[PDB]
């Protein structure tokens, strides 16, 4: 007997978001942008076991990069058997530098989040038996177990967020704000409330691939075993929207380029400042709660405002970037804000920008 499809409860903007973040075209586009062979590795065929085998192959490469073992070419060839790549049907290249190794780790971390979104969409047994089903976009929203509330122009934080975006975004071609959603991923709540005594909270940008937005909404910002970067194995944020915007992978839809950016509330507590890259970091030094790789510039602190979120004061920058003379010789042009415990961040807002 034919099941009733119930009318969609979602507003137009939210329907478009949910469409975009679970879009099979988007996911395949992302795989093509990462040089993967989508014909050999279709979305439905992606598995946790394959991804795990891919990480094992990179682990062997990393050991080799650091005695009569297999060549980097041999070890590369195994990686490429496990995770099919497309380079117009020429041979893929050997993974023979730290930079390329980390780039392959980052690719697999994105691919793991694509696989998460596919696994999330698997049809449950209850769903095969019920005689009515939600509209597919309601079903997809529900799978996130994440409350999203579209804000309008006159929500209390709206202008504050717009100002953060405009003032710290690129001077030329600032991203154009289309929508803001408030994000409430419950049971981020419990673990976040752990740091309730920890002051020094700031609202910070986190930009990402469109392909990982569903995973983040479902699971929060995460630190994975193979996460890395210029400040080690943590969660990376920026106070300058233009820095985070560099990591936004958007997608052409009609005549525009659509992308998504988060704002997280980050309990930074006692800050350890650095001025040179350190990819080996796994925690702040003792008695520090965060590591800030300080940039040549910082949003003018004299213009900071505050928002009250769950009864706590949260700093929100509102100023254009100004020079910080103490960090004029830093290896970082713009600051990178690092935490090394997932519990120190709560997602607060999601922005659609064109
Ligand atoms: C590959 C990793 N993505 C990021 O951390 C990407 C974006 C990011 N990097 C920054 C670095 C410095 C300052 C800001 C940012 C940021 O906003 N985004 C990732 C993707 C999926 C699952 C787990 N980790």
């Amino acid at each position: 007997s034919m099941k009733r499809v119930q009318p969609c409860s979602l507003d137009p903007a939210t329907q478009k978001l949910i469409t975009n973040i679970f879009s099979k075209e988007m996911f395949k586009n992302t795989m093509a942008l990462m040089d993967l062979d989508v014909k050999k590795m279709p979305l439905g065929k992606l598995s946790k076991q394959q991804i795990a085998r891919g990480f094992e192959a990179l682990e062997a490469l990393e050991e080799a990069l650091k005695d009569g073992g297999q060549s980097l070419e041999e070890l590369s060839s195994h990686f490429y058997t496990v995770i099919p790549h497309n380079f117009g049907h020429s041979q893929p290249p050997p993974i023979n530098s730290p930079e390329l190794l980390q780039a392959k780790k980052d690719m697999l971390l994105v691919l793991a989040d694509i696989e998460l979104a596919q696994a999330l969409q698997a049809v449950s047994e209850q769903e095969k038996t019920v005689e009515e089903v939600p509209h597919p976009l309601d079903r997809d929203y529900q799978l996130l177990k994440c409350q999203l509330q579209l804000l309008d122009s006159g929500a209390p934080e709206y202008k504050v967020i717009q100002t953060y975006l405009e003032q710290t975004g690129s001077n030329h071609r600032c991203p154009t704000l289309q929508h803001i959603w408030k994000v409430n991923q419950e049971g981020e709540e419990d673990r976040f409330q752990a740091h309730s005594k920890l002051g020094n909270r700031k609202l910070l940008w986190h930009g990402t691939n469109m392909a990982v937005v569903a995973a983040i909404l479902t699971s929060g910002l995460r630190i994975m075993p193979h996460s890395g970067g210029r400040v080690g194995k943590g969660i990376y944020f920026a106070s300058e929207n233009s820095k985070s915007a560099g990591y936004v992978i958007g997608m052409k839809c009609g005549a525009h380029h659509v992308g998504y950016m988060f704002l997280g509330e980050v309990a930074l507590g006692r800050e350890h400042h650095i001025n040179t890259d350190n990819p080996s970091l796994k925690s702040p030094p003792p008695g520090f709660d965060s590591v800030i790789a300080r940039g040549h510039t910082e949003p003018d602190p004299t213009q900071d405002t505050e928002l009250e979120l769950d009864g706590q004061q949260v700093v929100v920058p509102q100023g254009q970037p100004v020079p910080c003379p103490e960090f004029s010789s830093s290896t970082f042009s713009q600051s990178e804000y690092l935490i090394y415990q997932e519990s120190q961040c709560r997602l607060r807002y999601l922005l659609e920008v064109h």
Side-chain angles (χ1 to χ4, degrees), residues 1-15 17-38 40-72 74-172 174-196 198-354:
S1 179
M2 193 176 288
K3 296 194 181 194
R4 176 167 294 172
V5 178
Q6 298 176 336
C8 189
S9 75
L10 307 171
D11 67 76
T14 303
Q15 286 193 35
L17 166 69
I18 298 300
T19 303
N20 285 349
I21 70 173
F22 286 101
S23 167
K24 291 187 201 330
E25 203 70 71
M26 185 270 299
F27 288 129
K28 287 181 286 162
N29 289 349
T30 304
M31 289 172 73
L33 291 172
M34 294 187 311
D35 305 317
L36 306 177
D37 186 330
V38 176
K40 286 175 162 189
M41 200 171 23
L43 283 178
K45 197 189 191 172
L46 286 182
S47 67
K48 292 171 169 53
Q49 176 177 97
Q50 170 171 41
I51 285 157
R53 294 182 62 238
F55 277 116
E56 296 190 355
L58 295 177
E59 284 169 20
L61 282 156
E62 180 166 16
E63 293 279 297
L65 277 180
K66 296 164 173 168
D67 65 348
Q70 295 157 95
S71 59
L72 294 171
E74 200 165 9
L75 290 161
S76 289
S77 287
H78 174 70
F79 171 75
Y80 292 128
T81 295
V82 173
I83 307 295
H85 283 55
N86 169 49
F87 287 99
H89 295 286
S90 288
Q91 51 108 95
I95 299 174
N96 58 14
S97 53
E99 289 77 17
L100 187 43
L101 178 65
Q102 186 61 58
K104 294 327 200 175
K105 293 179 183 186
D106 287 353
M107 174 284 284
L108 275 191
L109 286 172
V110 169
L111 192 56
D113 281 354
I114 295 175
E115 190 284 331
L116 179 157
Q118 301 306 300
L120 199 57
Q121 283 188 307
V123 177
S124 62
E125 283 297 312
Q126 184 90 54
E127 291 179 334
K128 319 197 92 140
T129 65
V130 290
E131 288 199 12
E132 310 188 30
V133 303
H135 188 281
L137 297 174
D138 274 310
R139 181 179 182 253
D140 288 345
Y141 173 66
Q142 288 171 19
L143 292 164
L144 297 178
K145 300 179 163 159
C146 185
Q147 177 190 332
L148 292 176
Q149 256 298 333
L150 184 65
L151 302 195
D152 61 40
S153 292
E157 57 269 75
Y158 196 101
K159 291 184 181 161
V160 162
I161 288 174
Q162 181 158 25
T163 297
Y164 196 7
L165 169 66
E166 288 178 358
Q167 294 305 313
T168 74
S170 17
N171 265 359
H172 212 75
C174 183
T176 302
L177 180 61
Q178 304 303 126
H179 309 289
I180 312 174
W181 295 264
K182 184 155 198 48
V183 179
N184 181 25
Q185 159 118 89
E186 319 185 307
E188 278 202 308
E189 180 171 21
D190 289 4
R191 69 170 181 182
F192 193 61
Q193 297 277 5
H195 305 288
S196 48
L198 220 58
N200 191 29
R201 293 157 188 274
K202 192 170 272 176
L203 199 73
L204 288 173
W205 297 101
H206 184 86
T208 74
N209 270 271
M210 191 172 305
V212 312
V213 174
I216 290 170
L217 288 173
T218 300
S219 300
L221 298 178
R222 287 147 299 143
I223 303 169
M224 281 75 193
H226 288 296
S227 296
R230 301 173 68 180
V231 202
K233 189 184 171 184
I235 304 166
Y236 287 75
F237 303 83
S239 54
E240 295 188 40
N241 178 267
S242 66
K243 172 68 188 172
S244 286
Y247 303 92
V248 174
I249 312 296
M251 292 285 155
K252 301 297 185 312
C253 296
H256 46 80
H257 194 93
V258 179
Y260 297 104
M261 294 192 72
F262 290 92
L263 281 166
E265 172 189 346
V266 182
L268 292 166
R270 191 201 281 282
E271 299 171 3
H272 172 68
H273 296 172
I274 66 172
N275 71 356
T276 315
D277 301 29
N278 187 352
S280 87
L281 284 177
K282 300 222 203 71
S283 55
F288 297 91
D289 307 299
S290 57
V291 176
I292 318 313
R294 290 291 305 274
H296 299 171
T297 63
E298 194 66 27
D300 181 351
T302 71
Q303 300 304 99
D304 286 347
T305 193
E306 297 184 344
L307 291 176
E308 190 176 288
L309 300 176
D310 293 330
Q312 304 265 22
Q313 297 294 120
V314 174
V315 177
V316 186
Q318 303 280 263
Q320 301 234 84
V322 301
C324 292
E326 175 181 8
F327 295 103
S328 67
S329 71
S330 180
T331 65
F332 294 86
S333 296
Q334 296 168 298
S335 298
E336 310 194 6
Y337 284 72
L338 276 287
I339 56 175
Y340 297 87
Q341 303 184 76
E342 295 170 351
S343 60
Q344 275 172 268
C345 177
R346 168 96 168 260
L347 299 173
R348 287 304 195 185
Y349 305 94
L350 174 63
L351 289 61
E352 179 169 316
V353 290
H354 299 176

PDB file of all heavy atoms in Angstrom, residues 89 140 169 223:
ATOM      1  N   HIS A  89      43.068   9.486 -16.162  1.00  0.00           N
ATOM      2  CA  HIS A  89      43.588   8.162 -16.547  1.00  0.00           C
ATOM      3  C   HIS A  89      45.115   8.120 -16.854  1.00  0.00           C
ATOM      4  O   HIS A  89      45.579   7.253 -17.607  1.00  0.00           O
ATOM      5  CB  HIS A  89      42.793   7.611 -17.744  1.00  0.00           C
ATOM      6  CG  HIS A  89      41.359   7.328 -17.438  1.00  0.00           C
ATOM      7  ND1 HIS A  89      40.963   6.243 -16.688  1.00  0.00           N
ATOM      8  CD2 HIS A  89      40.222   7.967 -17.808  1.00  0.00           C
ATOM      9  CE1 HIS A  89      39.643   6.237 -16.588  1.00  0.00           C
ATOM     10  NE2 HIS A  89      39.169   7.272 -17.260  1.00  0.00           N
ATOM     11  N   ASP A 140      15.534  14.350   6.470  1.00  0.00           N
ATOM     12  CA  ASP A 140      16.948  14.669   6.475  1.00  0.00           C
ATOM     13  C   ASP A 140      17.272  15.636   7.637  1.00  0.00           C
ATOM     14  O   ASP A 140      18.259  15.414   8.361  1.00  0.00           O
ATOM     15  CB  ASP A 140      17.420  15.227   5.100  1.00  0.00           C
ATOM     16  CG  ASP A 140      17.474  14.192   4.005  1.00  0.00           C
ATOM     17  OD1 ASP A 140      17.437  12.976   4.269  1.00  0.00           O
ATOM     18  OD2 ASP A 140      17.586  14.618   2.816  1.00  0.00           O
ATOM     19  N   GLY A 169      35.738  40.318   7.210  1.00  0.00           N
ATOM     20  CA  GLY A 169      35.768  39.672   5.926  1.00  0.00           C
ATOM     21  C   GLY A 169      36.639  40.387   4.904  1.00  0.00           C
ATOM     22  O   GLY A 169      37.110  41.472   5.149  1.00  0.00           O
ATOM     23  N   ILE A 223      38.055  16.561  16.749  1.00  0.00           N
ATOM     24  CA  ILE A 223      39.467  16.286  16.570  1.00  0.00           C
ATOM     25  C   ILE A 223      39.615  14.810  16.241  1.00  0.00           C
ATOM     26  O   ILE A 223      39.166  13.963  16.994  1.00  0.00           O
ATOM     27  CB  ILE A 223      40.237  16.570  17.864  1.00  0.00           C
ATOM     28  CG1 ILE A 223      40.008  18.018  18.316  1.00  0.00           C
ATOM     29  CG2 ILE A 223      41.693  16.302  17.643  1.00  0.00           C
ATOM     30  CD1 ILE A 223      40.534  18.322  19.766  1.00  0.00           C
TER      31      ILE A 223
END
